[PDB]
């Protein structure tokens, strides 16, 4: 069980979740008030047509 634990514990990730969350963060909080009409994702287009 000692060897099992010593093998199980070191399973570190090559790219940690913290690193990718830091890299994928957005520095701008809120903007784009009039953008629910210019964008119009086609999921809404399916209903509109």
């Amino acid at each position: 069980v000692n060897k099992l634990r010593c093998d199980r514990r070191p399973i570190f990730g090559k790219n940690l979740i913290d690193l990718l969350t830091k890299d994928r963060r957005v520095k701008y909080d809120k903007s784009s008030i009039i953008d629910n009409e210019l964008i119009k994702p086609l999921q809404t287009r399916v209903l509109d047509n």
């Binding site: 008030i33 009039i34 009409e37 210019l38 994702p41 086609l42 999921q43």
Partner: protein, 441 residues
């Protein structure tokens, strides 16, 4: 502070009435080309024409790309500016025509600027106001909701339409933590606070400080988007657990040839919005260097594309003489550009340099690289540039500085440049070595 073949170029060094100074903005010589590019810049800033094409031609190492970079710098970061090498249009995923159209549309920009009224602050208290029912009834009737807001230096209580109650109910507003409401559209957004942050032993709820200034706020927000972003956002889906989202996530969504209908819809809605004064159009610049690598099909499609009414201004760079156009074998044209397209654009010449101009160029480049050279080596460097090439002399500066620093010196001398000549060769001496050797060299 990293320098790479540029960053000593800051504008065209122009002047009022459009006359170029001999030495200004990191530029020496090339007066006529700089004046023509300034006229082009003025035409761009006019924002009236569409699809105007200029091609600037000349020999290698004559400042052909520097001129385009200078006009991009003069135009300012606000306007779009799309650089492109002629070999990038050949994409495995999509046909070259659609890639050209995508880069063509990416140069057109749109600025969205609008104002918003905000009541943001820390909730003091909130209470419904009971009132007589408008109709016959037996029960409490709320006609207003009183909400008090306190921020740095400001405090104010407001009476609001009771129907907004659900907005609080959905927002889990609580009392005294945060609040941030829009004025006219209604609804509420919950942005805890530092006032009670240390009060609890530990909590997984974020805290924000007291908002600064008066509770009532006028905010002007401006952003810029290229039309290509609008097209790609309209075409691409978004959302959560919908089947289309799973399909997109599981398929590695390579680029697709966006239909013309979506582009027309985007154009119509954008025109409607700019009719209301909330949006503005900003034509940009599409710079393509080494156009000799373009195929004849791309040239033919460019012929039609330049005649559209939403085309940007396209500038092209080439350094070829009488050459056969790629994709054919019997058409020989100037600059490797078919005559029909040549008839559609304006040529801008570009002349080589003189020895004194080369010396000034080398001195300026040495100054921008944090190096000290006296005339006794600067003259030798100028002679090297006139003998081998200008770019060779420009490249040889850094090894000379490193060699000087190795000998615990500060100033570049004749010995350092001679040693750099011995160590690093130019093209001519390399070819001479190749020809005189017969050992697969």
């Amino acid at each position: 502070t990293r320098t790479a073949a540029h960053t000593h170029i800051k504008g065209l060094g122009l002047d009022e009435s459009g006359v170029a100074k001999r030495v200004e903005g990191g530029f020496v010589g090339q007066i006529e080309a700089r004046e023509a590019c300034g006229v082009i810049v003025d035409l761009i800033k006019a924002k009236k024409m569409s699809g105007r094409a200029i091609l600037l031609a000349g020999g290698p190492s004559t400042g052909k790309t520097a001129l385009a970079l200078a006009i991009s710098q003069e135009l300012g970061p606000k306007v779009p500016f799309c650089p492109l090498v002629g070999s990038e249009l050949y994409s495995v995923e999509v046909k070259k025509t659609e890639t050209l159209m995508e880069n063509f549309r990416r140069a057109i920009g749109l600025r969205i600027k609008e104002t918003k009224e905000v009541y943001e602050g820390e909730v003091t208290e909130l209470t419904p106001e009971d009132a007589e029912n408008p109709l016959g009834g037996y029960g409490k009737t709320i006609s207003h909701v009183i909400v008090g807001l306190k921020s740095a230096k400001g405090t104010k209580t407001l009476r609001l339409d009771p129907t907004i109650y659900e907005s609080i109910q959905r927002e889990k507003v609580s009392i005294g933590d945060v609040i941030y409401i829009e004025a006219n559209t209604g609804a509420v957004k919950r942005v805890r606070s530092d006032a009670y942050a240390t009060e609890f032993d530990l909590e997984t709820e974020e805290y924000v400080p007291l908002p600064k200034g008066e509770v009532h706020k006028k905010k002007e927000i401006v952003q810029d988007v290229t039309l290509h972003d609008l097209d790609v956002a309209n075409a691409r889906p978004q959302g959560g657990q919908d089947v289309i989202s799973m399909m997109g996530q599981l398929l590695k969504p390579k680029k697709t040839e966006i239909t013309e209908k979506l582009r027309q819809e985007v154009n119509k809605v954008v025109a409607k919005y700019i009719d209301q004064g909330v949006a503005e159009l900003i034509p940009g610049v599409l710079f393509i260097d080494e156009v000799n690598m373009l195929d004849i099909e791309i040239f033919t499609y460019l012929n039609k594309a330049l005649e559209s009414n939403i085309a940007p201004v396209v500038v092209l760079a080439s350094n070829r003489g009488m050459t056969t156009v790629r994709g054919t074998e019997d058409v020989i044209s100037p600059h490797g550009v078919p005559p029909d397209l040549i008839d559609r654009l304006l040529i801008v010449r570009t002349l080589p340099y003189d020895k004194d101009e080369i010396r000034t160029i080398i001195e300026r480049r040495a100054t921008v690289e944090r190096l000290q050279v006296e005339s006794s080596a600067l003259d030798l460097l100028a002679t090297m540039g006139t003998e081998t090439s200008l770019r060779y002399a420009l490249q040889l500066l850094a090894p000379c500085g490193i060699l000087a620093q190795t000998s615990n010196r500060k100033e570049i001398v004749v010995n350092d440049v001679n040693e750099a000549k011995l160590l690093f060769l130019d093209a001519k001496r390399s070819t001479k070595i190749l020809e005189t050797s017969a050992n697969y060299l």
